[PDB]
Design a protein around this ligand. Structure first.
Ligand SMILES: CN(Cc1cnc2nc(N)nc(N)c2n1)c1ccc(C(=O)N[C@@H](CCC(=O)O)C(=O)O)cc1
Length: 162
């Protein structure tokens, strides 16, 4: 099964602020809906509270070690091992994030979905960095800059095929 990371970040790798994210970019959330639809999202508790509801069309799966955590509309996994058990029959998995969630699935990733916003915000969680020792660009693009969406980001994708 394909473990794909799905991430938007600063030019300084910031992905988050207090708990809620640094920006607010409707069109970005579009690309995300699009590429993700019909696939499981694996996220941590704190990432889900930011979102604040289940994302329609996708098995939302939350990752806590806590044996008594439940939210409606979402599955809970208390392990990386469980995540693969729930997604046994699954084509592709999207690690939706929380930095610590990315750290968990680092030994398993085979595909990366990075958005790079050029502008630097105030906040404190970061994307766990990885490979100029790989991987392979497989796609680039620019996105909508508007009155809402005001920043030059680039939709990226990579593939570790080794
Ligand atoms: C806080 N946040 C986390 C978030 C935001 N942008 C990201 N962008 C990328 N590229 N990757 C992520 N991991 C990511 N995560 C959110 C908040 C709301 C929605 C949301 O309501 N998304 C709708 C999109 C359209 C809508 O807003 O209704 C969806 O169904 O996917 C998504 C992510």
């Amino acid at each position: 099964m394909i473990v794909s990371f799905m991430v938007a970040m600063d030019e300084n790798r910031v992905i988050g602020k207090d708990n809620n994210l640094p920006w607010r970019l409707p069109s970005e959330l579009q690309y995300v809906k699009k590429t993700t639809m019909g696939h499981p999202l694996i996220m941590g508790r704190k990432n889900y509270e930011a979102i604040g509801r289940p994302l329609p069309g996708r098995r939302n799966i939350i990752v806590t070690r806590n044996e008594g955590y439940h939210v409606e509309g979402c599955e809970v996994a208390h392990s990386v091992e469980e995540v693969f058990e729930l997604c046994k029959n699954e084509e592709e998995i999207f690690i939706f994030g929380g930095a610590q969630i990315y750290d968990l699935f680092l030994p398993y990733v085979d595909k990366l979905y990075i958005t790079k916003i050029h502008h630097a915000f105030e906040g404190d969680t970061f994307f766990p960095e990885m490979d100029m020792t790989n991987w392979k660009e497989v796609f680039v693009e620019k996105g909508l800059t508007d009155e809402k969406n005001p920043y030059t980001y680039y939709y990226h994708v990579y593939e570790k095929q080794q």
